[PDB]
Design an enzyme around this catalytic site. Structure first.
Site, short mmCIF file in Angstrom:
data_model
loop_
_atom_site.label_atom_id
_atom_site.label_comp_id
_atom_site.label_asym_id
_atom_site.label_seq_id
_atom_site.Cartn_x
_atom_site.Cartn_y
_atom_site.Cartn_z
N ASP A 648 0.84 -1.18 0.00
CA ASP A 648 0.00 0.00 0.00
C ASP A 648 0.88 1.24 0.00
OD1 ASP A 648 -2.71 1.24 0.39
OD2 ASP A 648 -1.71 1.95 2.23
N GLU A 677 1.29 0.02 -5.15
CA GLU A 677 0.56 1.11 -5.77
C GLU A 677 1.09 2.44 -5.27
OE1 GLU A 677 -3.60 1.82 -7.59
OE2 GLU A 677 -3.77 1.51 -5.41
#
Ligand SMILES: [Ca+2]
Ligand SMILES: [Ca+2]
Ligand SMILES: [Ca+2]
Ligand SMILES: [Ca+2]
Ligand SMILES: [Mg+2]
Length: 1054
Positions: A648, A677
């Site tokens: 994340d 991400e």
């Protein structure tokens, strides 16, 4: 000892000049520059600008003219002037700018609220935007410790703007009390003296974002260890000892410079050895650390002062093997800069590997106990290989959540719903559905947070879920008794039944399903879980029993059922970019209680914990958090047999830190895959971030948002009409416009460039023909001002058109599809959207339930929207569309566009879901049907992958990709074909391809076997090798290979 004494000015702390009377306000200007006596500087040129507006209106005679200097002091004393100000009422506020002439003395427009200060008598300082309740408060701020803009960055270097070219610059330190001016008004604490210097090259390398800071040097023989035991304050004074500023000191730099080399060589936690149990926690600044042992019922049964290692700053104690299974915490005595106290509290182990219910106590565990393993655990193998780039490229991910999977499934035993163990219920609808997806070529399950989250209460008595009586909800949620739904507390029905009733008159003006769910959210078992409490324990609430070790074996059991029964590999979402909380008081603040201000990223000036992630930003750039991260991944890799990790907000990590954790973890299993991400981070000033651009060539994957946006249409900030106007390739951009859009053919062609490039792996150097017929590299295709293509290998790119965050694919299509697109056409839009991912060279990623047209009733951010909005119905009655208006706080400005678009066609039923599922399994079976779909290597992709129907005269919406297995590409990778054609005709017209006339092209076997249920149903390959494509269709065609390798479909040099 001949030194000038640093001191306050030799004046008393000022009282108040005047207290406001009725219908009055009063403002003091504290002339701190003047109190540093010498000159009785005159206050005639001082004046107040004052005005009324709609917010603050309480003035009685504003002078609207800006150049009027007439509002001069009502009076003055040695501490400065003051102003008596008439008012209309005493409840409100008034606007104030403070001036000398027309010059502003405080730049900020000040505002004094009569709510804050009920005596409406306030004080301010020149150059400061704060509004104090008294002149004493202001005076004490001016000469007191403020902010934390001094950075002790290594043993002998202190960076601090406050000390620039002042004659006295000192580091004051106090072991047991906070530094302060004593009774003499003097600073009599011990101090080290600092002399000006210039930053090292090594320091500018370590802290580029502080390299412009004025640097200072500490005597080489300073006792660093002793200073870091208590409070440290940097102070600056003039030549006569009058203090100019004092600030707190950020110490993470000197902590790494002093201890990290030694502490990195040690192992941490409660560790089962052969001679017993070794406990070790890193606490370089703590004064005391006692190991507290608890019985099963949480009574103290021992307390051990630990042994500090001087070189590492770590504390350790060895005890008996019988301590296995015991609960423990660390009792810290440690200075916390945020509170400026020497705190005393008990903290769980950041290296905990087992916990009690709700993470209150960590627990000694030996994860290697066969009693914590399901039968056969030690021989569990990866069902899918991850060695070669081609292995990795075949990855086809099913992003899932523990409650999303099993919460609503009546065919999972009730006690296993929302539990890891639901995955062992081999006869359930959910598990049978995953097994069939696996058989068709879904290869990986990716789990939303299953480490220990903070936000779900693991005490089952404190939780109410919608399958339980509404009365239980009222019992555990005190807000429900005083809500519009109170009457249901005695109703006798479940909460799910009440929510069902509320749908009937639910609308944009009566958003009542959402209104009740908001309350249900606060106290249910539901959350995505991006809220780290402990990084290396499974989540407790997903176990049938959260007290103790049970969750460890249930979790491993689930891992076994996935790899062994279901035949899929397992990826974990991990959230190392932040912690749930920080500071010395919050229950879920762990790292920041034990080594304060080290594990969080702080603002360079105030020392506040930054919140750019959402929450309490962590500092992976610091050596011992980098170790904590890598040690954590190691345990998930070795002890839980996790095949990959998804970071994340990866771009909040240094590239070097991700690459270092990767090398460390590859040393344990070289086939572990890393990806993440990132879209937001502006940490570029502190280090080279782990971004899409910066990771080219590293083999770290990143989610690509290029094909995503191009196929879904629009972007994540869309709202209102833009959600409908911004159509994508999947929903008819250009070719089937809706009534609101203005998308031009050029824009639609640009979207097709992005999609093609993503189907070729989103490579930086891939060459393609763009929308205007020009040659371009991938890096040259624009994506909102950035290079579109950015990878070196397709394995560095994760393509997707739906994910847990933002709207589901189906809800986007419902936003954007033209009215005339009937239900069957929308199902094919879902499938053509997913074909660009599934048949592309990038790694394929998808949201759990796209194969069921999954909806969230337009909810855009469903992290806390409960079982209701995140429902996936594996009995296939519907797709959870149209179950209520979504959460108003996040989607309320979208209620008008939802109401307009929502009822255009009927809600998908069993027939459409089963048709979508067949479409889906067809696409995944095709993806793994030939090695040509998953070439893995970028240079191979460029050698073999090409496109037809390009340029300014392209037939809009028709994507034609060719993959070469012929002579000009090298080896034949597929014994049975010389080449492959992928045709996605995302358009309302039938289309015909002459490109392959004469070549003996034929439709793939998988599609012909599917018959009338195929995405290619109705495709015609004529005798001359021309191909007719139906509207909204996907065709995979092949050149059959003969006795030897043929000419295939050679790429053209452009
Ligand atoms: Ca006051
Ligand atoms: Ca938890
Ligand atoms: Ca919740
Ligand atoms: Ca071949
Ligand atoms: Mg910053």
């Amino acid at each position: 000892p001949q030194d000038v004494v640093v001191r306050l000015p030799d004046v008393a702390v000022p009282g108040e000049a005047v207290q406001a009377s009725a219908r009055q306000a009063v403002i003091h200007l504290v002339d701190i520059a003047g109190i540093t006596s010498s000159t009785p500087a005159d206050y005639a040129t001082k004046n107040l600008y004052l005005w009324n507006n709609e917010t603050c209106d309480a003035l009685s005679a504003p002078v609207a003219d800006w150049n009027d200097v007439s509002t001069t002091p009502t009076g003055s004393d040695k501490y400065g002037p003051y102003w008596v100000i008439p008012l209309t009422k005493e409840s409100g506020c008034i606007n104030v700018i403070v001036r000398d002439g027309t010059n502003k003395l405080i730049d900020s427009d000040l505002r004094v609220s009569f709510s804050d200060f009920t005596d409406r008598t306030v004080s301010v300082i020149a150059g400061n935007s704060a509004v104090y309740d008294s002149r004493a408060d202001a005076f004490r701020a001016a000469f007191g410790v403020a902010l934390a803009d001094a950075h002790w960055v290594d043993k002998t270097t202190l960076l601090w703007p406050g000390g620039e070219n002042k004659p006295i610059v000192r580091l004051y330190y106090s072991h047991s009390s906070k530094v302060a001016a004593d009774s003499n008004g003097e600073f009599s604490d011990k101090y080290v003296k600092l002399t000006p210097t210039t930053v090292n090259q090594q320091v500018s390398m370590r802290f580029p974002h502080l390299a412009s800071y004025p640097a200072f040097k500490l005597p080489d023989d300073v006792n660093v260890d002793e200073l870091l035991q208590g409070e440290t304050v940097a102070i600056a004074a003039e030549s006569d000892g009058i203090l100019s500023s004092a600030t707190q000191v950020q110490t993470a730099g000197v902590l790494d410079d002093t201890y990290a080399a030694a502490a990195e060589a040690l192992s941490y936690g409660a560790q089962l050895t052969d001679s017993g149990v070794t406990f070790r926690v890193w606490a370089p600044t703590a004064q005391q650390v006692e190991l507290v042992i608890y019985s099963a019922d949480k009574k103290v049964i021992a307390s051990h002062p630990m042994t500090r290692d001087s070189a590492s700053g770590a504390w350790s104690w060895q005890g008996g093997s019988d301590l296995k299974g015991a609960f423990y915490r660390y009792a810290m005595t440690v200075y916390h800069p945020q509170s400026r106290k020497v705190e005393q509290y008990e903290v769980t182990d950041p290296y905990a590997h087992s916990l009690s219910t709700n993470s209150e106590y960590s627990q000694v565990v030996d994860l290697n106990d066969s009693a914590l393993k399901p039968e056969g655990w030690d021989g569990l193998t990866m069902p899918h290989a991850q060695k070669t780039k081609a292995d990795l490229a075949k990855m086809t991910i099913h992003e899932s959540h523990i409650r999303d999977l099993s919460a609503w499934d009546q065919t999972v035993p009730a006690e296993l719903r929302g539990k890891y163990l639901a995955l062992t219920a081999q006869e359930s609808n959910m598990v049978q559905h995953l097994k069939q997806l696996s058989a068709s070529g879904v290869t990986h399950i990716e789990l939303l947070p299953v480490f220990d989250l903070a936000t779900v209460n693991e005490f089952s008595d404190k939780v109410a879920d919608i399958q339980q009586p509404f009365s239980r909800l009222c019992e555990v949620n005190s807000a429900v008794k005083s809500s519009e739904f109170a009457g249901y507390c005695d109703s006798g029905s479940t909460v799910e039944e009440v929510l069902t009733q509320l749908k009937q008159n639910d609308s944009k003006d009566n958003p009542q399903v959402q209104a009740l769910n908001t309350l249900v959210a606060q106290t249910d078992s539901y959350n995505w879980g991006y809220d780290p409490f402990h990084y290396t324990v499974p989540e407790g609430s997903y176990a049938t029993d959260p007290e103790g070790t049970a969750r460890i074996k249930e979790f491993r059991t689930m891992i076994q059922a996935i790899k062994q029964d279901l035949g899929m590999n397992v990826i974990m979402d991990v959230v190392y970019n932040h912690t749930n909380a920080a500071g010395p008081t919050d229950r879920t603040s762990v790292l920041d209680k034990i080594v304060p201000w080290y594990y969080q990223r702080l603002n360079e000036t105030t020392g506040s914990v930054e919140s750019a992630t959402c929450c309490s930003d962590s500092a992976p750039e610091h050596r011992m958090f980098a170790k904590l991260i890598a040690d954590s991944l190691a345990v998930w890799t070795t002890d839980y047999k996790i095949d990959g990790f998804r970071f994340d907000l990866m771009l909040y990590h240094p590239k070097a830190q991700i690459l270092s954790a990767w090398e460390r973890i590859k040393a344990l299993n070289p086939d572990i895959y890393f990806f993440g991400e990132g879209w937001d981070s502006n940490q570029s000033d502190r280090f080279e971030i782990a971004s899409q651009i910066n990771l080219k060539g590293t083999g770290i994957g990143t989610f690509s948002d290029r094909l995503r946006d191009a196929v879904r249409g629009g972007g994540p900030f869309d709202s209102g009409d833009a959600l409908r106007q911004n159509q994508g390739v999947g929903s008819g951009a250009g070719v089937l416009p809706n009534e609101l859009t203005t998308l031009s053919d050029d824009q639609a062609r640009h979207l097709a460039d992005l999609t093609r490039l993503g189907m070729a792996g989103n490579l930086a150097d891939f060459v393609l023909i763009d929308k205007d017929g020009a040659v371009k590299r991938g890096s040259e295709i624009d994506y909102n001002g950035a290079p579109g293509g950015y990878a070196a290998d397709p394995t560095e790119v994760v393509n997707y058109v739906s994910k847990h965050d933002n709207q589901t694919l189906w809800d986007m299509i419902s936003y954007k599809a033209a009215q005339e697109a009937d239900l069957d056409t929308r199902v094919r839009m879902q499938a053509v959207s997913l074909a660009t991912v599934m048949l592309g060279q990038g790694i394929a990623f998808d949201q759990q339930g796209s194969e069921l047209l999954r909806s969230k009733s337009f909810t855009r951010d469903s992290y806390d929207s409960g079982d209701w909005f995140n429902r996936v119905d594996y009995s296939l009655q519907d797709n959870n569309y149209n179950v209520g208006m979504p959460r108003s706080s996040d989607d309320g400005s979208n209620y008008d566009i939802i109401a307009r678009v929502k009822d255009a066609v009927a809600t998908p039923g069993e027939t459409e879901l089963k048709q979508m599922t067949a479409f889906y399994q067809e696409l995944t079976a095709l993806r793994k049907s030939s090695p040509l779909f998953t070439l893995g290597d970028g240079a191979t992709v460029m050698k073999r992958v090409d496109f037809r129907n390009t340029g300014a005269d392209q037939q809009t919406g028709l994507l034609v990709m060719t993959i070469d297995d012929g002579m000009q590409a090298g080896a034949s990778l597929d014994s049975r074909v010389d080449g492959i054609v992928v045709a996605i005709n995302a358009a309302p017209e039938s289309r015909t391809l002459q490109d392959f006339a004469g070549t003996s092209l034929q439709l793939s076997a998988i599609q012909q076997a599917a018959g009338d249920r195929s995405l290619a149903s109705g495709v015609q390959v004529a005798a001359d090798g021309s191909v007719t494509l139906p509207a909204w269709s996907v065709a995979v065609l092949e050149l059959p290979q003969g006795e030897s390798q043929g000419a295939g479909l050679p790429v053209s040099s452009k």
